[PDB]
């Protein structure tokens, strides 16, 4: 389980180091739209939720927004592109605290290249 590490300024914005062998535990709360970005020039192929009506999905280029829409929405998101495949264990938080506004990636292989 890759738990995002938050920024030092506000713990609303978090970063995760991408990994083929692990999933991202996302703590989504009610009433917030959360922002996810891809690599530059990454072509989105398909996405598949465990529950299509539990979350709301709209994608623009390399930017992914997901939104809660139903109580007890605990499913997964598998958004796949040409470069790789993402895995998030979407979990609603009940108390509307410890939110996470935007998730960012740190890529080891690209940085090394």
């Amino acid at each position: 389980l890759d738990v995002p590490s938050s920024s030092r300024y506000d713990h609303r914005i978090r970063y995760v180091t991408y990994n083929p062998a692990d999933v991202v535990q996302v703590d989504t709360v009610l009433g917030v739209a959360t922002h996810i970005m891809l690599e530059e020039g990454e072509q989105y192929l398909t996405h598949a939720f465990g529950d299509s009506e539990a979350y709301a999905f709209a994608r623009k280029g390399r930017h992914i927004f997901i939104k809660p829409q139903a109580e007890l929405a605990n499913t997964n998101l598998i958004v796949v592109t040409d470069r790789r495949s993402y895995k998030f264990r979407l979990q609603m938080r009940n108390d509307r605290n410890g939110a996470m506004y935007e998730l960012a990636f740190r890529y080891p292989d690209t940085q090394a290249r």
Partner: peptide, 26 residues
């Protein structure tokens, strides 16, 4: 996520007036 008579042909065609419009000084 997001919201939302007429004869005399030759002499009479040489008598057709030439009317040139006047000008105004600018």
């Amino acid at each position: 996520l997001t919201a939302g008579g007429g004869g005399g042909g030759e002499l009479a065609e040489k008598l057709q007036p030439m009317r040139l419009s006047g000008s105004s000084a600018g």
